[PDB]
Amino acid sequence: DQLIASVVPELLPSAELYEDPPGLEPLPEEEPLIAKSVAKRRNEFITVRYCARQALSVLGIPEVPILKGDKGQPLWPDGIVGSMTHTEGFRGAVVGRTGEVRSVGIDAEPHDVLPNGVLKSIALPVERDELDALPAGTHWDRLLFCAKETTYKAWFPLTARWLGFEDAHITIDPDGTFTSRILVDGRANDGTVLSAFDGRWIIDKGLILTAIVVPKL
Ligand SMILES: CCNC(=N)NC(=O)Nc1c(CC)cccc1CC
Ligand SMILES: [Mn+2]
Ligand SMILES: [Mn+2]
């Protein structure tokens, strides 16, 4: 019944918590990253890393700090890829080994309409027309935004480059899948070319969860 486990393969352990349990602490090496942060930010940072460390233990990796790189990206141990996300009512993480998968991204959002003006900032004109044609009963605008965030999180670890909202065209299928088509240069750091990603999505517990796994070559 866990949301991340429903949209990623069994080979990628995941862990999620819906509240901030009492008594958690960051590892000493992580404390400087949130020393001057408000309580809401300290709590999501600490709880998501407790989830990541649980998933890393399933891979046989013991307790390790998860620091942030120059573009805010989490810095995983050698031979590990992963992703983390937090929203009100959700903290989650997923990790995998580089010999099984190339990259993973996840994102969680509340299942509600986007705030005013956000859809115009994140969607291509063609995506807006596509969302209007989808069946009634799902907040397609919020699902599109969620899928764009997951696209960036799967892309950045492979390219080390920015990806704007206008740089990817996402097509959502009501069956719980989506595709992301990259509209800019897709040269990856390993010499290969990224052009498209396949994603999965689920709506449950008032939340939307999207995931992309970039598979082994
Ligand atoms: C496909 C285009 N999507 C993105 N480029 N998305 C992000 O940059 N998202 C983001 C933002 C901007 C909303 C701020 C802080 C941290 C992150 C990284 C998860
Ligand atoms: Mn967050
Ligand atoms: Mn997010």
Numbering used by the authors: 5 to 221
Copy text from the publication.
Phosphopantetheinyl transferases (PPTases) are essential enzymes involved in primary and secondary metabolite biosynthetic pathways. They catalyze the transfer of the 4ʹ‐phosphopantetheinyl (Ppant) moiety of coenzyme A (CoA) to a strictly conserved serine residue of carrier protein (CP) domains present in fatty acid synthases (FASs), polyketide synthases (PKSs) and non-ribosomal peptide synthetases (NRPSs). The covalent attachment of the 20 Å-long Ppant arm to CP domains allows tethering substrates and chemical intermediates through a reactive thioester bond and transferring them to the different catalytic centers of the synthases where enzymatic modifications can proceed. Owing to their role in activating enzymes essential for bacterial viability and pathogenicity, phosphopantetheinyl transferases represent novel and attractive drug targets.
Despite the absence of inhibition on M. abscessus growth, and since 8918 was able to inhibit ACP conversion in our in vitro assay, we wanted to confirm binding to PptAb using X-ray crystallography. Crystals of PptAb prepared in the presence of CoA and Mn2+ were soaked in a 5 mM solution of 8918 and the structure of the complex was solved at 1.40 Å. Interestingly, binding of compound 8918 to PptAb displays the same pattern as that observed for PptT. Three hydrogen bonds involving the catalytic base Glu153, one hydrogen bond formed with the main chain oxygen atom of Leu167, and van der Waals contacts established with Lys152, Tyr156, Lys157, Trp166, Gly168, Phe169, and CoA are found. It is noteworthy that a second 8918 molecule was found at the surface of PptT11, which is not the case for PptAb. We found that 8918 inhibits ACP conversion by PptAb at nM concentrations and that total inhibition was achieved in the µM range. The fact that the Ppant of CoA is perfectly ordered in the structure of the complex with PcpS, which is not the case for PptAb-CoA-8918 ± ACP complexes is in accordance with the finding that 8918 inhibits its target by displacing the Ppant arm, which decreases but does not abolish catalytic activity in the case of PptT11. Indeed, unlike M. tuberculosis for which the MIC90 of compound 8918 varies from 0.56 to 3 μM on clinical isolates, it has no impact on the growth of M. abscessus in broth culture at concentrations up to 128.0 μM, probably as a result of its inability to penetrate the cell envelope.
